[PDB]
Every structure is written in structure tokens, then in C-alpha cells.
């Protein structure tokens, strides 16, 4: 099968001339590690780079960067033949010059700013006609090789010298501009970008495959998520990386036209892209296009909506165009467009986590340099409620504040700025911290979905419960055969009841990190908001959000909060039924049990829980968390004292003994109060950098137990009544 | 296509996309065009966007289009032999003007197919493609209970597409036209379908589904006295109409099931539907509370209307006393035992035709809080009590429950029947479930054997929790003896 052709893929390294290959793949060519490898693709262009080592890519594929893809004029999903070239080659005469599209507004020398700190200790086989991009000077600069010594036998070396004339050239449409968007500009979106990549590769890279076969490819791809996540960025990247014409249809642009012309624009926007097949049609916003929910106003709005509806289902094959749309509000779409044949694929993209946000900062700051004391790991923690677009504004403001601080007293009265000062302009912590304060997040009320970083090591004691939870949600998902053979269905959910403060939230958070699944948390007041607001239909969206974000786990904190609001222990003139829990019970019956979802219920008063949830089919597994013992309290303090270094004279084993009715949360404020004393005494004595023993002794005077003594017996009498394992001690058979 | 008549398709949004006047002319010109090509069939794609004259009351052209359609409907004074057809997803979203006689008098309600119906859809949509020997469509028709017929087409298309991305990914046949010697050899396995099942998002999971349960009388252990009473009440008037018409006495309207919870009142209602070859509609507890809390009791009219056209059918109401418990229960409140949800049911049961092949089954667990307004003759007179299972009946319950999973021969269920005294039918299901979980746990633990052992049931006895208490047991007996009261008149005879 000629094992010398490999499929291309996106590179994981930020370097330019790097080729990633696996160790088993590398020995198949019988080649060494440090050398030059020649790549032959299509369009009679060649490429030579440096091969590297990988261990987690695939069985057989090549991982190459975006800048090196432009030289070969190849895209993702294309085959390329790789052959070695073990020959020693040097460089004698090199003549390169950039294009005016990227060096417009730059004066001064063009050697010691971009050519010297690019080729030092690099040894890259720069081929004739290749296009490479240099990052630096807080901007993007790209060069090109016009003429040199006849290729091959050309490698940059310190012996040769670089010369440039000074006048730029004019580019053509043969090469693709590197300033456009690509697959390397997406951060955090890993699970959801793959679905779009696999759904679009086949009907675009191979248009003739679907033309001959009768399989119906998906037409509409509706996008979700709060504004600023990057729905337009993904739509443009998937069109630029697939060689398909991209057409952008703005929401207000249609509405700005008069009567009839807006109707003609949508009609003329389809056959225009049809001739340029393959093509991708993207709609910016749909709230202002089809708000047919409660408007019922305007004669042209319904006509435009119906015209769009007719243009959707009217694409009877013909071309191989794929239409895409993006809406921030999933609920603001008319059901007519959600019918099959118009919009059947739905992608929900949420707010990225800290790891995802760090990639956004790395992406938006790749063209600019940063000081040694500058780390992006810290800034990704405080911006928990920031959208991907907020980080772009944050870094832009941080870069701008540097000019107002360092370039304020200089006053270079020049018509064009130079480059010898712009590159030297560094950005520190003082520039970023000021921008953090000025930044106003635009997404803080929606339900965020994140995977907690807490593991089982951060939970002290309660080892009996951990095995029960690990044996209930991990076997049916990873041993499906033993469940299908016996035919018995897995459990739906679990209920956590017991005294408050034992850490019921931590048990639900830790099971999400072990299963590599999402986690959705609903607090107490979140349930009371719907009960007081007379709107119990808001929980349907909560249930629907968890379904598409598979796998996921659902958490309900203090479900008995509504019962306490209507009397609690004494109750009221009614029963234990309400309207918020009614919708949850109705939705749990209709949800598919075959999905990778789970529901966890937390409560502290089991005597006021509605018994309607305990019957088989909704919630049967009840887990009780008892009071921590002496042997378990040491581990709680040991896990809590991991974030701050402590001394060795702190005898936590002694503190474990006098604590009798202290719960898990009852010991956190003790440590917090002890730590506050260290800061207080350090600031007082400033006019030492370790916590002392005396801090804990003083905090013992304010040791307040959150749980009383009368309710302790009520949990024990409830547990013994629920278990009742008496009577049948040990029975045997005669034979 | 199968009758040799010209087919004309009229799309909903297609009419609306036109300007003023042209949309009026399209409907007019769409009729005589098909008239000359008689016979013909005129089909309308959607009617929600054509005649939404319910609460809109907006737009000047919408009413004109609706009236033009109305005039074109009743204006077909024979002439040709054209038949006009229309399709609407929402039965409630049609103006009553079109429902008048002469325009739309025939109504066909098509629902979500069952597993047997869904298997035929998979066979139809995969007849042109081949499948491996380990590929069976019987399993995939069970997990897709909430899937529409169009969802299965997308499911099989995605399953076929994923095979290309897995087998035709590293080949890279750079050819302008694909061949046939490789496409035929491309088989589809379980791994291709299971991936498509996860990615498929059903679009119909909130509506009331209608299905015929597969549970028969063999799956219900014991309670043989009740089964004959139910078989003698809903099967004779439907298959011996002559003996009912000759005597002139009307059949019973419905039955009420009361007793301790867990005895399996739902199974009794489900089994009678499979024997009579009729449909089955089930309404749970929270389904009734949704209308009581939402201040919208008119939603039950659609529930009643759905069962009528789906004849024959049976109607089931689980825990009808759920609303009474929400307002105080045993102690009650400042009001009586009347509410708004049951009021509409009582009003609708009076107006329903008794000659249809329909039946209503009521289930409850607290007979002391049931509104007496439903017990008076004409609505609900037959009351059936399900007592606690006896020792001889508990063996059959376990035998029927242990049919889905093969068990060993050393499991002596007759012994387990004896110490169980207050255990109901549902009280024994969790025992078997807990015993079966132990087998999986020990198999996975010892993996780093393929039969249930005796020791699994011994361990599950420690967590044997009875759902019913001991104080409420006497309340059912005292209620039953008060309701029956067959004392006094022992045996009377006549002198001649
Ligand atoms: N996830 C992301 N990664 C990188 N850049 C982003 C991301 N999301 C947004 N941006 C940047 O924010 C700018 C505005 O995006 P915007 O058009 O608001 O996205 P959307 O249309 O999805 O709201 C874009 O120029 C883009 O570069
Ligand atoms: N068993 C435990 N081990 C370690 N920390 C605990 C434990 N229980 C509680 N905590 C700590 O107490 C704090 C408050 O927990 P809390 O919200 O009261 O839990 P719950 O909601 O279950 O009552 C948490 O931040 C957690 O870190
Ligand atoms: N008499 C019985 N025979 C067999 N199984 C039963 C019986 N009674 C109950 N079950 C089982 O118990 C489970 C729960 O029934 P449940 O919903 O509690 O009935 P009900 O609604 O009448 O109380 C059912 O899945 C059923 O299989």
C-alpha cells in the first residue's frame, strides 16, 4: 500500500518548523531524530523541515503546523508523501524581503529586530519560495524568499549573512494569507470542535463522494453559547481550513433594507454560493431574524422568516453547500426551523475553564512578548466568569496601558513609529492587574458548567462512602456487558442526607473529576427563585443543558429548602408537594436512562423530604454521611492544610481528640481564624513568615459548632429505623 | 403514487414568502391546474404557518389568505374528482372554521410507533445496505423508545457515515469517481451504531406517548381472584353485545383500584390492555399536579380526546389522591375534597360516549381521602381491592420476576416466601435487584463465576426494608369490612 504517505493533522507545538511523529512511526522509515525530512504533497511544491518525537498522536499520521501548510498549498484531511534526505547542505547567499501588507508602518533596521532572534541556534532548512511568519514586536510579520542560490542545498548557517534591499513586493491569490483565522485560534473547545470537524470534513473535502451515494448529509448546523464565545470564529476557521467559500449573513443587515430588497438578498445569497461549490453559508444572529415566539407583529418579519424557511428545505442536493447559523439564546428559535431537514444538528459551546482560558491568553498574546515574572496561570483563576471575548479585551487593555505608562513622557513626534522601541516594550503584572479591575464580565447570571479539580485526596475520612459511589456510577459505564447480559438497569441517582457541614457537596464534586465528566450544581436559592417567581418551567432548560453536555452529573443542594420556607418541621395547611419538585419529577420520568448522566441529591432534613421521590424509578439509593470520627478528623485537617505551608509543631492528632461534635465544615473556620492571626501579627509587627502554634490556641476560644445536640439523636433514630437489620442474625440450611 | 393521481405539494412558508396579491393568486391557480389532471391529490405541508387564527389577530394578509383557502375548500362543487389533504403537527392549532363539515371532516391521528413498528422502519431504511452477522435490529428498537420515525433515518444515516470515517480514513483513494468493489464490502457493526445512538437527540419526549405493553398475566404473580373479575368486566360487553342489548342493561364505565402501595396496581391495568388488543394511556401522579399548580385544568380535555380516536384504548390514572395529599392529606385543609383537576375529569366522563371501545382505570392508595363525587352511579362504581400477597402468591411473584435473568437451582424461593409477612409485591423487587448487583460487583472485583449464587440473596436480607408500615394495615381491613358488611343475612330459604 506504499507505506510512505501519511495524513496531515494540526500541530500541538507553537514552533514554526516542527514535524511531530511517533516513536513506532519513526523507525519504519529507518531514520534518525535530529535531521531534515523532505515532504512532497501536491501542486509540485516541496517542503523540508525538522522532525520531532511524539508519543500520543496516533497509529499513523503526521502533525504539521499552519505556516508550513501554506507552502505546500495543502489543507486538513489531505494525504502527503514523506521521504528522507540525509545529505549535508549549507548556505552561501540568502536574499529575502517581506510583503508590504505586514510591514506597513515600520521603520528602522529590519535585521537585528526580526532576523537575528529567529535563526540563532535553529538550523532550519529554509527552502526557496517558502513563506514563514515571525512573531515579535507585539505584531505579526511574515517574510518570503524571492531568489537565492538554486534549491536544493540551502540551509541557513551562521557563516552566511543576510541582505535586504528595502522595497516590498505584491502578493497574489495563489498563497493564503496567514493573518486569517485557523484551527490554532481555538482554545478550550476540544470535545465540541471535533464534532464539527468530523461533520464537515466528508461533505466538503470529497464533494463527489456524496454526489454518487444516496446518503443525506446534514444541512443545518446551529450554534449555541453566550455572545463572545467565538461562534463566528469557528465558522470562519472551518471554512478557511477546508477550501470552501465562506458567506457571512448579518442579522441587522437584512433588517436594514426596505421592503422587497431584504427578500431579494436572501434569495440571491444562495445561488451565488451554489456556483462556488463547496461553500459554507453562515448566519451571524437569529434573534433579530426569526423572533417568532411572542412578537406576532410586523408584516415583513413573517415574510422574511418564511423566505428563510423555504430557502432552507429547498436545497434539493444540487450543490454541496452547508448552511450554518449561530444563536446565543437556544430558547429564542422558532420550532419551524428546528424541524428535520433544516436544523437537525445542535452544538452547545460554553464558557471555557481555567485550562481553556489559559489557551485563549496564549493565543491572543503569541505576537507579543512578556517578562519573566509574567505568568498566565494566575490570571486564568480570577477570571472564572469571563467569556473568551473578554480575554481579548483584557489583553488589549493590558497592552494599551503599557503605552500610557512607558510612552507618555517620551513624545516621539514622528509620522511613523520605529521597531527598535516597540519590541523592547514589555508587559508586567502591574499592567495586567490594572486591566483586571477595569474589565466588566458580561456573563455572570447563566448556569456555568465546569469540571471541579477536587479529588479524593482532598476529602478527609469517609472511606466507606467513597467505595459505594465508585461502585455505582463507574461500573455501568465501563462494564456494559455485565449489565446487558443480566438485563437489569442501572440506578438512576443517589440521595445524600445527614447533618450539615459533613461535606455533601465535596462528594458530588469528587465523583465528577474521577469519571472525566461535567458537573452542574444547583444551590438552594436557585430552587426558591422559581417557587417564589411562579415560574417552574425554568428547570426544563437546566435538564436540557446537562443532556447535550454528555457525560455530565447533576447536583441538587438542600432540596428541602422549599419545605422549610413553608413551615419546615411543623409544615402548613398543605402537604409536602410543591411546584418546583413536580417539574423535576416529571422530567426525570421522561429522561433517557441510556445516557451518561447522573443526578445527585443533597439534603440535611430527611424528615421533610417528599416521599414521592423515593419510589423505584426516580431515586432509590440513599447514602447517609455520619459524624466524622477521631481517626477521620486528622485527614480532614491534613487535606485542608495543603494549600498553605504549616510548621511541624502543630499536633493535629491532639486537636482531633477534644473535637466531638465538630463536623467537617466546623473545622474550616478554625483554620481560617488561625491563619488570619498570622497576617494580623505580621502587619502589626512590620512597622515571622510561618504560622506558629499559638495561632491555633487562640482560635479555640471561638470554636462554635454549627450543629446542635438535640438533632444528633434524630439522625441516628432515623437511620436505625431505615436500616432495621435485627431479627435475622444468621440462618443456615440443614443440607 | 400508488393510485395513479397527480400529486400537488403546497408548502406552508412558500405561500408566505410571496408578496401581497401573488400569494393569493398561487392558491387560486393551484386548484384548476390539478382539476384538469383529474384525478388529483392536493397536499398541504403545514397549516400552523397558514391559518394560525387562534390568538394572533394580527396582519391584514393572513386573514385574507385564510379566507381564500376557506373559499377554495368548500367551493369544490363536484366538477372534478380531486381530493385535498392537509397535515398539521398540532391538532389544537387549527381554526374551527376549517373543521366545519364539507372542508375537513376526516381526521387521522398517527402516533409514535412501538418497538415492532420501529424495527420495520430500520428494516426499510437499511434495505439497500448490508449488515454483519452480529448485527441485529431487535436490540436498537428498545432503547429508542422516545424516537420518531424520522429520527431513525438520521440514526441509520449517521451509522453509515461513521463507517467511512473509520475504515475509509487512512486509505485516501485520490480518485475522481469511487469504485464499487470496496463500497459493497463496507460493513456496519455494533460499534458504528452505538456511537450514533449517543449522538442522536430525540425531538419528542414531552408529549403523551401511546403504546401497548408487552406484559401478560404470566408476569403477575398471584392475585388470581382479581384477574377473573377484570376479564369478566371489559371482555364480555365487547365480544358479546347481543346479551347486553337484549337485556338493555348498560356496561360498567370504569374500575377503581385501591389498597396498600406496591401491590402492583399498574400491572393490573397494563395486563388488561395486552389481552384486549387495545391501546394504553398512562397518567402518573405529577402529571395531575402539574395542572393543579399551573392553574390550567383544560389540558385534560386533550388527554381525553386522544384516547377516543385511538380506539380501542384504555385510560389509566395513577394515584388520583395525589392532589388531596398536596393540600393536607389526612388532616385536609379549610376546604373540602373537591379541586379543579378532578372537576374537569368528572365533567368529561359525563359527556363521553359509552358505546365506544374505551375504558378508564383509577388507581389509588388512600381510599379515605378520595372525593365521594366519583363513586355515584354513572362515573365509577366498580371498586376492586388488592389485599396483601399471601405465602402461596409470593412464590409466583419471585418466579415471574426472575424470568429475565437465568438463576441457579439452589435458590429456594419457597423458604423466602415464609419469613416475608408484610412484604408487598414491590417490596421484593429491590431484594432481587440488590442480590443481582452483588454478582456484578464480585465479578468485576475478581476479574483482575457467570451465574448468580445463593450467598447473594442472604446478604440482601440485611437491607430488607418494608415500604408499608404496620399502623396503616388495619386501616385497609377496617375500610374493606365496612364497605362489604356481608353479615346478618346468612342463608334464607322459602317454605315452598
Ligand atoms: N474562544 C476564542 N478564542 C479566541 N478568540 C476569541 C474566542 N472567542 C472570541 N474571540 C475573539 O473575540 C472577537 C469577537 O468575537 P465575536 O464575533 O463576538 O464572537 P461571537 O460571534 O461568537 O459572539 C473575535 O475577533 C475573536 O478573535
Ligand atoms: N469531610 C471533609 N473533608 C474536608 N473538608 C471538608 C469536609 N467536609 C466539609 N469540608 C469543608 O467545609 C466547607 C463547607 O462545606 P459545606 O458547604 O458546609 O458542605 P455541605 O454543603 O455538605 O454542608 C467546604 O469548603 C469543605 O472544604
Ligand atoms: N404482584 C406482583 N407481581 C409481580 N411483580 C410486581 C407485583 N407487584 C409489584 N410488582 C413489581 O414492583 C414494581 C413496582 O411496582 P409499583 O409501581 O410500586 O406498583 P403500584 O404502582 O401498584 O404500587 C413493578 O415494576 C412490578 O414489576
Numbering used by the authors:
A (entry chain F): 21 to 707, 728 to 775
B (entry chain A): 260 to 707, 728 to 775
What does the primary publication say about this deposited structure?
The human AAA+ ATPase p97, also known as valosin-containing protein, a potential target for cancer therapeutics, plays a vital role in the clearing of misfolded proteins. p97 dysfunction is also known to play a crucial role in several neurodegenerative disorders, such as MultiSystem Proteinopathy 1 (MSP-1) and Familial Amyotrophic Lateral Sclerosis (ALS). pmcp97 is a member of the classic clade of AAA+ ATPases and is an essential cellular enzyme. p97 is composed of six protomers forming a homo-hexamer with an N-terminal domain (NTD) and two tandem ATPase domains D1 and D2 (1). p97 is an essential protein in regulating cellular homeostasis from membrane fusion, Endoplasmic Reticulum-Associated Degradation, Mitochondrial-Associated Degradation (MAD), Chromatin-Associated Degradation to NF-κB activation (2). Critical functions for p97 include the translocation and restructuring of proteins from large cellular structures such as organelle membranes and extraction of ubiquitinated client proteins to facilitate their degradation through the ubiquitin-proteasome system. Here, we present cryo-EM structural analyses of four disease mutants p97R155H, p97R191Q, p97A232E, p97D592N, as well as p97E470D, implicated in resistance to the drug CB-5083, a potent p97 inhibitor.
Although we would expect the E470D mutation to have minimal effects because of the conservative substitution, residue 470 is located at a critical juncture between the D1 and D2 domains.
